[PDB]
Symmetry: C3
Subunit: 136 residues, 3 copies
């Protein structure tokens, strides 16, 4: 309908990450409005409203048994997940959120311990989201 | 647009909970329209339409047996997620659905073979969903 | 506002490099998903969400790969793995711009996918988020 904002993004992870750092998904497939920045890993809200996000982060198979990944809004964790495998086999840390955001809010995925697989261009580890409703 | 139904929720889980009747996600982050009730663990439809739901449940079961988390619509399973590990008690059970619902329908998560854990921040086990289209 | 959305589960075992034919169809608004091919075919330009959750078969192998493809190109990859040949899932999600005729589907890239019968363990769903003009 006229006036509905179109805001959506989807990016994969080319480079491996470990420890406690923000995941800079840099294989950008969709980025309507350029509100996702692959140089920072952050989606920045431009319109107050209700947003969906999801993430799938592949643990570094063959090199460790656990890896944690959090979805953050500004300075707060809003979703958490753990990948774990006693044989160091591949496993995912994945979760999804629905959040109200205000302009300037940042949403991003941060590692919270362990090692993440670096996918080159294969998009094994991903971050995506979109606006569901704009506030009146 | 203004006037169109805005219905969306997201909830985590405080501490560890059995869910063999219903898993009552009780850390409610988003509940636009208040169609999710943390005291019953159910999302109740009030508008005919198409709805998305997803869940990510961190479960702990007995050594070496399968466990599962089912998304139910009324008395029917509409998705399931199964996990089994040889000597790892904690694993995720996650799935996603798109469902047509009528007023009165109840959508919720039920567990078997293990207990759900919210982790320290309540955000490791989650349930979310929203209306995609309203029947008109 | 166009209404296009689907959701289906995998009844039968698949293996190797074949397309996954999710044939336990729960939702298929607009009839744009074909359970006999496993493919969603775009009918109007726009922005679409898809997600999949594919269960690896137990007791016959330790790895399985399942990739979401757009036309003949991988747009998301996933691996399931369990060294004791127990279950594991290969899952991912995407947001894609599509044009009419574009096909979106899940294809194996090695390994065996569990045939769930009516259990809806292994799933594929999607919907249009915004239509183009
Ligand atoms: Ca999802
Ligand atoms: Cl590419
Ligand atoms: Na690093
Ligand atoms: Na899954």
């Amino acid at each position: 309908a006229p006036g509905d904002p179109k805001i959506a993004f989807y990016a994969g992870l080319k480079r491996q990450h470990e420890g406690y750092e923000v995941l800079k998904f840099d294989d950008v497939v969709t980025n309507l409005g350029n509100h996702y920045d692959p140089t920072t890993g952050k989606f920045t809200c431009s319109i107050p409203g209700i947003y969906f996000f999801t993430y799938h982060v592949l643990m570094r198979g063959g090199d460790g048994t656990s890896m944690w990944a959090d979805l953050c809004k500004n300075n707060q964790v809003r979703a958490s997940a753990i990948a774990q495998d006693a044989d160091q086999n591949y496993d995912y840390a994945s979760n999804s959120v629905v959040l109200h955001l205000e302009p300037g809010d940042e949403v991003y995925i941060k590692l919270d311990g362990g090692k993440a697989h670096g996918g080159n261009n294969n998009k094994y580890s991903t971050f995506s989201g979109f606006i569901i409703y704009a506030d009146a």
